[PDB]
Amino acid sequence: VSAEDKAAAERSKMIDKNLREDGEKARRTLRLLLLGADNSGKSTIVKQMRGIFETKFQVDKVNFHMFDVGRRKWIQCFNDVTAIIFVVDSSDYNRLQEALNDFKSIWNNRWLRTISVILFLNKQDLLAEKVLAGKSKIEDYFPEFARYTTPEDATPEPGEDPRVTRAKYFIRKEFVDISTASGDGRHICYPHFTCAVDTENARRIFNDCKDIILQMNLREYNLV
Amino acid sequence: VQLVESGGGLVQPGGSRKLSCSASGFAFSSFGMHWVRQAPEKGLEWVAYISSGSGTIYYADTVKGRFTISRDDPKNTLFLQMTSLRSEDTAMYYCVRSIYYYGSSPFDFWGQGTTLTVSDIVMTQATSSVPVTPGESVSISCRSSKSLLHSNGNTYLYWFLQRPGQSPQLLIYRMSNLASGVPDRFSGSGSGTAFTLTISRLEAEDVGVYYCMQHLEYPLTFGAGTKLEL
Amino acid sequence: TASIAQARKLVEQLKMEANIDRIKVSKAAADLMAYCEAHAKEDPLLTPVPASENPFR
Amino acid sequence: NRLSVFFSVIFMTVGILSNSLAIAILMKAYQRFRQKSKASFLLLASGLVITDFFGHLINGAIAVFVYASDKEWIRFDQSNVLCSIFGICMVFSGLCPLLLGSVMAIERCIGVTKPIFHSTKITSKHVKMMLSGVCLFAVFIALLPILGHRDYKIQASRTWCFYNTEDIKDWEDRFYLLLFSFLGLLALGVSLLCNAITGITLLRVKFSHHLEMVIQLLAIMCVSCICWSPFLVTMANIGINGNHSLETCETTLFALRMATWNQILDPWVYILLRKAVLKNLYKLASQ
Amino acid sequence: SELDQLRQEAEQLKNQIRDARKACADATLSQITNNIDPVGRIQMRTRRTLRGHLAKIYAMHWGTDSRLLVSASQDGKLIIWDSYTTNKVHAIPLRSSWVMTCAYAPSGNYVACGGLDNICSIYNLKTREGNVRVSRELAGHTGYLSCCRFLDDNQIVTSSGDTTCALWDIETGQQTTTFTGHTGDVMSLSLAPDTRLFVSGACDASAKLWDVREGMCRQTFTGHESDINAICFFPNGNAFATGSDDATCRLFDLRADQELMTYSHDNIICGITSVSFSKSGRLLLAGYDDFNCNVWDALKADRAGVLAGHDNRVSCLGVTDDGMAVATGSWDSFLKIWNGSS
Ligand SMILES: O=C(O)CCC/C=C\C[C@@H]1[C@@H](/C=C/[C@@H](O)COc2cccc(Cl)c2)[C@H](O)C[C@@H]1O
């Protein structure tokens, strides 16, 4: 090893030191992927909490970095995010089947087998008004809704109409049925009912991320 | 890229003096730094070296124990603390930057120098002076006591040109490569211990003293120097 | 009139591709085989070099 | 009578095989999990199994040598250097697993109760610093009698070297026994406290891998305490009551062999006795 | 009426091309190369492991000196490696960490990269300041940047997910030529040795040959059943190989205008990420999703060897210009240098 080679090798180690320091800084934030349709309203979810659109929000001194790309090819980039925030518009019955197929592609993606999905069934206030009016029927788009009943073990919110509760649990069940059809516990869906004024979405992500990281640790401790 | 030296001046024997080298226009923390001095009517002599990140420090034997070299990266300042100054230390001290990676050009930039007045591989340049005329080809020879060819294929030989009144400038690094901003007429050829610097179509600007330096190992040593005169 | 404009472009492109000169596959196969044979000796991955000539010892 | 060559040979053989099998599995598992996270547990588990592998090898080889030499310490250890080396190895091979098992309990308690803080604030360097600090601390305690002008004395069985326990007079002689017993019992106390918190937390959260982990924690708490409590309490009894206590040679020797199985069962309780691990070994055994 | 008539003529033209290709398919490459001896078993060892990337490696490219290489990872770091010593020469922090491609200029003075930011960024490696700086950001693509290759210090070709390729003038920052005709995301491109043509593979399972100067598609190559992820020119420029998600590699001929050979195995059911040729072109090296790199006999479609040294997807690979070694990059954040021994 020559005199210049030693100086070059010392330069390499100074590079390695800053590579490790930046890697530790990158691990101090949790990375989220925001997905949804045009009518989902995922932008309003982000704004209340706050080629690639990025937003940073903090919950209990924990930094979250959420990416909204604005797809089978570039979805491989987000192979190591903490969670995927998939947003749907539950009010629009016509496009619910599009969301179910969109959710099915993400859930069954080969490069997202270990990524848990934090489902946000957005715009619940519109869904409640739509059921109350009765002009449109979910049974028209989903024939199996006519024979669906609210589970006896269900826990509806106080002051909630049973018709709205029956509709909300049916819509949630459709997404959950896709989630439980495959995965075998590698990833877990975390459905939530959100509206355009709900301000607890950030904490719901924080609480769900605790379970996602805990499930990750449990596989490390057990799958040895 | 700028390198300004300060702190030089007339000092009493046995005294202490602090030399500063302020760097501007380049990433100072990325470059290793050398101090090179030149005694009046004498050749260049390497003094000390501090690496990027201050992790490695080297001194010449004639100054080891008396000189301390340090740098302040946030202030982009290079320091040389001198103690027990002798009459042998009267020289012009140059601040030299040098970065080391594959294909880099160490010793590429020299400072203007500061004057201090006090009240081992052998590099040989036997030809002290060469009378030259413009437009004629000139060859300068350098010899080393040890082979400068390393087992990695590099030959750590450098060529410098010090025009009258100016700081030295890098011409050839690692015995064959041409430094940035140097005309293509300069060409470096060598093998083992014998090296030749060929200057085709000599011009007025090329007039000066030429030094060959080895970077195979520390301490870095310079040749006596070959002067070109018209 | 977007579809009709695109149809003309696709048809025009297929005309250019259909008018090229094609050599036989046997002729093309021989050329690929010939190039591999001629440069076989200067392929270090095909014929590994002695350790003295390997920069990655 | 109660002592024989085959006791050391069988325990060393099983301990080496159990640890060597766990080393191969841990190396493959770490490469898979180092991509998802820092795999702090797999780093600490690897340090434990490697330490136990050398604990059974270095101490087992010396013990077999003493048995093969007809326990002739005077003839073959005139310089009194082997006993000091044997004492340092025995203390390190027993104290380090106790401290390492205590750090793993703390590390996995944070990873369960505070998963986000564990994931983001704690880095891979901190785990390596903690892993190295425990091993160095165990070496420091092992070297403490040597630096304190004391020397490890040959025990009653005359087959292993440890602190002086027969006719202790000076207060420094009884200090080493108390210090070793206190550190061992403190490690067990911290391991019990952290594993219990982790197990209780999972049960509350559960009501997939929660029940698998709870059974793992129960095995760690039972095996660690049952194996090491008789020896640690015996040393405390000797340290406090001195020779007046009924600490017979048979009782001390039996307690030592119980503590030996803690290192033997550590690969099984931490790694090998896992449903994922057993399935992989089932396929390998068939092939 | 007019629209219906025109689309009928396209079908007739497609049959005309298909008949024309069938006319010149007198023999098969397998029949031609049956007599030649096989390459035997190709054994390569990991000479070097490049450590320092802390995330998935997405791209690598050798420099023309066969010693320096640039790799891109989604930790937002461009690293230039000295492969002989494993020393890191540079570490370029990327403004956008979602990088998908990287290129080393043939002169060695520039590197390029880009990803989901829809930008191809040019970095100057030879500055008087001693640091790497961005020299150009090439904007104009409306999709992610999937591949980029320098023609010289002033020209670069980029492929994007907006179904188009572009030729750029780096000094002016404008795309002089746009290559349109792919109906899916273009995932890769390869330059011909003379840099007058380049092939691109898209997710429409088709490979198009483009003229750089003229700016139009000369030929279209079909035959894959899924998205094409990788493409590489044959060393003489008269052929190229592709890799798709259908677990197959196909060798297309430019002059014969058709596929010549398929490289697939029954055990292989995973997608292909990267393809490259040895210096003589006799070996086709392909990276796979099953964590392995399979070395194929290009002429005989025989699996010559396997490079098994990664614990995640092999995302990229490349062979040096002198043919001495092959580098493989992977999602496990490591790069490995391979060559055989006598
Ligand atoms: O002759 C006899 O019957 C008894 C003497 C045997 C001497 C050493 C026993 C070693 C074992 C070492 C295990 C280490 O983990 C140390 O274990 C301990 C245990 C109690 C206290 C402390 Cl401080 C550490 C190894 O398995 C094989 C061999 O028998």
XYZ file of N, CA and C in Angstrom, chain A residues 1-11 14, chain B residues 51-52 56 99-100 150 152 156 158 174 215-216:
72
model
N 0.842 -1.189 0.000
C 0.000 0.000 0.000
C 0.881 1.245 0.000
N 0.689 2.101 -1.001
C 1.511 3.290 -1.167
C 1.015 4.424 -0.273
N 1.768 5.528 -0.275
C 1.412 6.679 0.550
C 0.100 7.307 0.099
N -0.120 7.396 -1.215
C -1.373 7.953 -1.713
C -2.535 6.988 -1.522
N -2.270 5.682 -1.567
C -3.326 4.708 -1.317
C -3.828 4.789 0.119
N -2.922 4.991 1.081
C -3.349 5.161 2.468
C -4.203 6.410 2.633
N -3.809 7.507 1.983
C -4.612 8.724 2.022
C -5.958 8.522 1.338
N -5.984 7.737 0.258
C -7.249 7.423 -0.399
C -8.123 6.539 0.481
N -7.521 5.553 1.150
C -8.286 4.677 2.031
C -8.827 5.440 3.233
N -8.052 6.394 3.755
C -8.547 7.243 4.833
C -9.705 8.115 4.367
N -9.670 8.566 3.110
C -10.802 9.298 2.551
C -12.035 8.410 2.455
N -13.670 8.151 5.859
C -14.423 9.357 6.183
C -15.745 9.400 5.429
N -3.813 15.548 7.073
C -4.780 14.956 6.166
C -6.135 15.642 6.303
N -7.020 15.354 5.352
C -8.414 15.745 5.497
C -9.019 15.040 6.702
N -4.394 12.155 10.115
C -3.012 11.777 9.848
C -2.162 13.035 9.780
N -5.525 16.495 -2.579
C -6.608 15.547 -2.349
C -6.192 14.207 -2.941
N -6.569 13.119 -2.273
C -6.093 11.788 -2.641
C -7.276 10.859 -2.872
N 5.414 1.657 -7.868
C 4.804 0.828 -6.843
C 4.217 -0.433 -7.466
N 1.280 -1.370 -7.388
C -0.059 -1.131 -7.910
C -0.050 -0.530 -9.309
N 5.015 7.237 -8.579
C 4.694 8.453 -7.831
C 5.800 9.494 -8.011
N 6.342 13.518 -9.505
C 5.658 14.762 -9.815
C 6.647 15.760 -10.397
N 2.163 11.814 -11.077
C 2.379 10.380 -11.279
C 3.061 10.099 -12.618
N 6.397 11.048 -4.389
C 5.329 10.847 -3.418
C 5.164 9.371 -3.072
N 6.226 8.580 -3.239
C 6.160 7.161 -2.908
C 5.989 6.949 -1.409
